[PDB]
Design an enzyme around this catalytic site. Structure first.
Site, short mmCIF file in Angstrom:
data_model
loop_
_atom_site.label_atom_id
_atom_site.label_comp_id
_atom_site.label_asym_id
_atom_site.label_seq_id
_atom_site.Cartn_x
_atom_site.Cartn_y
_atom_site.Cartn_z
N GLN A 20 0.82 -1.21 0.00
CA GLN A 20 0.00 0.00 0.00
C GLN A 20 0.86 1.26 0.00
O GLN A 20 0.38 2.35 -0.33
CB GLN A 20 -0.92 0.02 1.22
CG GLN A 20 -0.21 0.19 2.55
CD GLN A 20 -1.17 0.13 3.73
OE1 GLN A 20 -1.38 1.13 4.42
NE2 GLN A 20 -1.76 -1.04 3.95
N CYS A 26 -5.01 0.81 3.97
CA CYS A 26 -5.12 -0.58 4.41
C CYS A 26 -6.56 -1.07 4.31
O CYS A 26 -6.81 -2.21 3.91
CB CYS A 26 -4.62 -0.71 5.85
SG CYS A 26 -5.47 0.37 7.05
N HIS A 165 -5.17 -0.93 11.81
CA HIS A 165 -4.78 -1.49 10.53
C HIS A 165 -5.75 -2.56 10.05
O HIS A 165 -6.11 -3.47 10.79
CB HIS A 165 -3.37 -2.07 10.68
CG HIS A 165 -2.71 -2.48 9.39
ND1 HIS A 165 -2.50 -1.61 8.35
CD2 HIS A 165 -2.18 -3.66 9.00
CE1 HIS A 165 -1.86 -2.23 7.38
NE2 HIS A 165 -1.66 -3.48 7.75
N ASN A 186 -1.07 -9.38 4.59
CA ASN A 186 -0.82 -7.98 4.90
C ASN A 186 -0.60 -7.25 3.58
O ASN A 186 -0.48 -7.87 2.53
CB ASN A 186 0.41 -7.84 5.80
CG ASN A 186 0.42 -6.53 6.59
OD1 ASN A 186 -0.36 -5.62 6.33
ND2 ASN A 186 1.32 -6.44 7.58
#
Length: 224
Positions: A20, A26, A165, A186
Protein backbone atom coordinates in the site's frame (compact mmCIF):
# COMPACT_ATOMS: atom_id res chain seq x y z
CA UNK A 1 -18.11 -29.52 11.36
CA UNK A 2 -15.13 -27.21 10.82
CA UNK A 3 -12.17 -28.38 8.71
CA UNK A 4 -8.92 -28.61 10.72
CA UNK A 5 -7.12 -26.39 8.23
CA UNK A 6 -7.96 -23.78 5.56
CA UNK A 7 -5.85 -21.97 2.96
CA UNK A 8 -7.67 -20.03 0.27
CA UNK A 9 -4.32 -19.33 -1.39
CA UNK A 10 -4.04 -23.01 -2.32
CA UNK A 11 -7.56 -22.93 -3.72
CA UNK A 12 -6.75 -20.12 -6.13
CA UNK A 13 -8.90 -17.53 -4.40
CA UNK A 14 -6.10 -15.17 -3.32
CA UNK A 15 -4.15 -12.78 -5.54
CA UNK A 16 -0.57 -11.68 -4.98
CA UNK A 17 0.64 -9.63 -2.03
CA UNK A 18 0.64 -5.85 -2.55
CA UNK A 19 2.32 -2.86 -0.95
CA UNK A 20 0.00 0.00 0.00
CA UNK A 21 3.00 2.26 0.41
CA UNK A 22 2.72 5.52 2.35
CA UNK A 23 -1.02 5.81 1.73
CA UNK A 24 -3.13 4.83 4.75
CA UNK A 25 -5.30 2.70 2.45
CA UNK A 26 -5.12 -0.58 4.41
CA UNK A 27 -8.93 -0.57 4.62
CA UNK A 28 -9.16 -0.59 0.82
CA UNK A 29 -6.66 -3.44 0.47
CA UNK A 30 -8.42 -5.52 3.14
CA UNK A 31 -11.75 -4.99 1.39
CA UNK A 32 -10.30 -6.04 -1.97
CA UNK A 33 -8.79 -9.27 -0.62
CA UNK A 34 -12.23 -10.32 0.61
CA UNK A 35 -14.03 -9.30 -2.58
CA UNK A 36 -11.41 -10.91 -4.83
CA UNK A 37 -11.86 -14.00 -2.67
CA UNK A 38 -15.63 -14.43 -2.77
CA UNK A 39 -15.67 -13.66 -6.49
CA UNK A 40 -13.15 -16.40 -7.15
CA UNK A 41 -15.09 -18.83 -4.96
CA UNK A 42 -18.41 -18.05 -6.66
CA UNK A 43 -17.20 -17.85 -10.26
CA UNK A 44 -13.95 -19.82 -10.29
CA UNK A 45 -12.21 -16.81 -11.85
CA UNK A 46 -9.52 -15.02 -9.82
CA UNK A 47 -9.52 -11.32 -10.74
CA UNK A 48 -7.39 -8.53 -9.27
CA UNK A 49 -9.58 -5.62 -8.20
CA UNK A 50 -9.03 -1.87 -7.80
CA UNK A 51 -8.19 -0.57 -4.34
CA UNK A 52 -7.74 2.81 -6.06
CA UNK A 53 -11.44 3.02 -6.91
CA UNK A 54 -12.31 2.71 -3.24
CA UNK A 55 -9.79 5.40 -2.34
CA UNK A 56 -11.05 7.89 -4.94
CA UNK A 57 -14.76 7.04 -5.04
CA UNK A 58 -15.76 5.68 -1.62
CA UNK A 59 -15.70 9.07 0.08
CA UNK A 60 -18.99 9.29 2.01
CA UNK A 61 -17.46 8.09 5.29
CA UNK A 62 -14.08 6.66 4.35
CA UNK A 63 -11.26 9.17 3.96
CA UNK A 64 -8.83 7.96 1.28
CA UNK A 65 -5.17 7.87 2.34
CA UNK A 66 -6.12 9.13 5.78
CA UNK A 67 -8.05 5.99 6.69
CA UNK A 68 -11.31 4.11 6.36
CA UNK A 69 -13.41 1.08 7.25
CA UNK A 70 -13.94 -2.16 5.31
CA UNK A 71 -17.64 -2.36 6.13
CA UNK A 72 -18.13 1.16 4.70
CA UNK A 73 -16.30 -0.03 1.56
CA UNK A 74 -18.48 -3.12 1.16
CA UNK A 75 -21.52 -0.84 1.29
CA UNK A 76 -19.99 1.31 -1.46
CA UNK A 77 -19.35 -1.69 -3.69
CA UNK A 78 -22.89 -2.94 -3.11
CA UNK A 79 -24.50 0.38 -3.99
CA UNK A 80 -22.23 1.58 -6.78
CA UNK A 81 -22.24 -1.22 -9.33
CA UNK A 82 -19.41 -3.37 -8.00
CA UNK A 83 -15.64 -2.94 -8.07
CA UNK A 84 -13.61 -2.36 -11.23
CA UNK A 85 -10.45 -4.35 -12.06
CA UNK A 86 -6.94 -3.29 -11.05
CA UNK A 87 -5.87 -3.07 -14.70
CA UNK A 88 -8.68 -0.64 -15.45
CA UNK A 89 -7.94 1.58 -12.45
CA UNK A 90 -4.36 0.94 -11.14
CA UNK A 91 -3.11 1.83 -7.66
CA UNK A 92 -1.46 5.26 -7.31
CA UNK A 93 -0.94 5.29 -3.54
CA UNK A 94 -2.58 8.72 -3.43
CA UNK A 95 -6.14 9.95 -3.68
CA UNK A 96 -7.32 11.47 -6.95
CA UNK A 97 -10.56 12.39 -8.74
CA UNK A 98 -13.04 9.50 -9.06
CA UNK A 99 -12.73 8.52 -12.73
CA UNK A 100 -14.02 4.95 -12.82
CA UNK A 101 -16.80 5.96 -15.23
CA UNK A 102 -14.52 6.89 -18.12
CA UNK A 103 -12.11 4.17 -17.03
CA UNK A 104 -14.89 1.62 -17.56
CA UNK A 105 -15.42 3.02 -21.06
CA UNK A 106 -12.50 0.99 -22.38
CA UNK A 107 -12.30 -1.47 -19.43
CA UNK A 108 -15.81 -2.61 -18.27
CA UNK A 109 -15.02 -5.65 -16.08
CA UNK A 110 -16.40 -5.36 -12.54
CA UNK A 111 -17.25 -7.60 -9.58
CA UNK A 112 -20.61 -7.25 -7.77
CA UNK A 113 -21.55 -8.20 -4.19
CA UNK A 114 -24.98 -8.43 -2.55
CA UNK A 115 -23.72 -6.82 0.64
CA UNK A 116 -21.72 -7.84 3.70
CA UNK A 117 -21.99 -9.58 7.06
CA UNK A 118 -20.24 -8.75 10.34
CA UNK A 119 -18.68 -11.54 12.37
CA UNK A 120 -20.13 -11.33 15.90
CA UNK A 121 -17.81 -9.08 17.93
CA UNK A 122 -14.88 -10.84 19.62
CA UNK A 123 -15.84 -14.32 18.45
CA UNK A 124 -12.78 -16.22 17.15
CA UNK A 125 -15.12 -19.16 16.84
CA UNK A 126 -17.46 -17.34 14.51
CA UNK A 127 -14.41 -15.96 12.68
CA UNK A 128 -13.16 -19.51 12.13
CA UNK A 129 -16.35 -20.65 10.43
CA UNK A 130 -16.52 -17.49 8.33
CA UNK A 131 -12.93 -18.15 7.21
CA UNK A 132 -13.78 -21.76 6.41
CA UNK A 133 -16.16 -20.36 3.78
CA UNK A 134 -14.16 -17.39 2.45
CA UNK A 135 -11.42 -14.84 3.16
CA UNK A 136 -12.48 -12.38 5.88
CA UNK A 137 -11.58 -8.72 6.44
CA UNK A 138 -10.33 -7.91 9.93
CA UNK A 139 -8.87 -5.05 11.94
CA UNK A 140 -5.80 -5.44 14.13
CA UNK A 141 -3.29 -3.39 16.10
CA UNK A 142 -0.25 -3.38 13.84
CA UNK A 143 1.65 -0.39 15.28
CA UNK A 144 3.40 -2.40 17.98
CA UNK A 145 7.12 -3.16 17.67
CA UNK A 146 6.59 -6.93 17.82
CA UNK A 147 4.03 -6.98 15.00
CA UNK A 148 5.90 -4.41 12.91
CA UNK A 149 9.12 -6.42 12.91
CA UNK A 150 7.57 -9.90 12.69
CA UNK A 151 9.48 -12.07 10.20
CA UNK A 152 8.48 -15.72 10.67
CA UNK A 153 6.63 -18.30 12.74
CA UNK A 154 3.36 -18.06 14.64
CA UNK A 155 3.13 -14.54 16.06
CA UNK A 156 2.23 -14.90 19.75
CA UNK A 157 2.46 -11.20 20.68
CA UNK A 158 3.18 -8.64 22.18
CA UNK A 159 0.27 -6.48 21.00
CA UNK A 160 -2.78 -4.72 22.39
CA UNK A 161 -6.13 -3.79 20.87
CA UNK A 162 -5.58 -0.26 19.58
CA UNK A 163 -7.01 -1.18 16.17
CA UNK A 164 -5.33 0.86 13.44
CA UNK A 165 -4.78 -1.49 10.53
CA UNK A 166 -7.09 -3.40 8.23
CA UNK A 167 -5.96 -6.74 6.80
CA UNK A 168 -7.54 -10.03 5.74
CA UNK A 169 -7.53 -13.62 6.97
CA UNK A 170 -7.25 -16.09 4.09
CA UNK A 171 -7.04 -19.24 6.20
CA UNK A 172 -6.04 -20.97 9.43
CA UNK A 173 -4.14 -24.00 10.66
CA UNK A 174 -1.93 -25.49 13.34
CA UNK A 175 1.85 -25.12 13.46
CA UNK A 176 4.01 -28.21 13.96
CA UNK A 177 4.46 -27.28 17.63
CA UNK A 178 0.68 -27.48 18.02
CA UNK A 179 -0.02 -23.72 17.99
CA UNK A 180 -3.18 -22.65 16.12
CA UNK A 181 -2.90 -19.61 13.85
CA UNK A 182 -4.70 -17.31 11.41
CA UNK A 183 -3.13 -16.79 8.00
CA UNK A 184 -3.19 -13.03 7.51
CA UNK A 185 -2.47 -11.33 4.20
CA UNK A 186 -0.82 -7.98 4.90
CA UNK A 187 -0.34 -5.12 2.45
CA UNK A 188 3.23 -4.11 3.27
CA UNK A 189 4.75 -5.85 0.27
CA UNK A 190 6.00 -9.45 -0.16
CA UNK A 191 9.32 -8.89 1.64
CA UNK A 192 7.57 -8.37 4.99
CA UNK A 193 6.91 -11.36 7.23
CA UNK A 194 6.40 -14.71 5.52
CA UNK A 195 6.24 -13.53 1.90
CA UNK A 196 3.87 -10.75 2.90
CA UNK A 197 1.91 -12.91 5.34
CA UNK A 198 1.84 -13.22 9.11
CA UNK A 199 0.48 -16.19 11.03
CA UNK A 200 -1.29 -14.75 14.08
CA UNK A 201 -1.90 -17.13 16.97
CA UNK A 202 -5.51 -18.35 16.87
CA UNK A 203 -7.69 -19.11 19.89
CA UNK A 204 -5.14 -17.51 22.20
CA UNK A 205 -6.17 -16.37 25.66
CA UNK A 206 -7.13 -12.87 24.44
CA UNK A 207 -10.92 -12.42 24.55
CA UNK A 208 -11.19 -10.58 21.23
CA UNK A 209 -8.36 -12.49 19.58
CA UNK A 210 -4.66 -11.68 19.45
CA UNK A 211 -4.15 -8.07 18.31
CA UNK A 212 -7.94 -7.75 18.42
CA UNK A 213 -8.25 -9.75 15.20
CA UNK A 214 -11.80 -10.92 16.01
CA UNK A 215 -13.08 -7.55 17.23
CA UNK A 216 -14.24 -6.02 13.94
CA UNK A 217 -14.32 -8.72 11.26
CA UNK A 218 -16.65 -8.68 8.26
CA UNK A 219 -17.02 -10.36 4.87
CA UNK A 220 -18.92 -9.79 1.59
CA UNK A 221 -21.96 -11.78 0.44
CA UNK A 222 -22.31 -12.84 -3.22
CA UNK A 223 -24.66 -15.39 -4.82
CA UNK A 224 -26.20 -14.59 -8.26
Amino acid sequence: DLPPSVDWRQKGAVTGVKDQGKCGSCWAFSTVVSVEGINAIRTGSLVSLSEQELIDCDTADNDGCQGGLMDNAFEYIKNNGGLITEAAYPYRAARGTCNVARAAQNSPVVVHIDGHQDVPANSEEDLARAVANQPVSVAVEASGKAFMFYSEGVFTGECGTELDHGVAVVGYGVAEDGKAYWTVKNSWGPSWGEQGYIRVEKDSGASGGLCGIAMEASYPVKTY
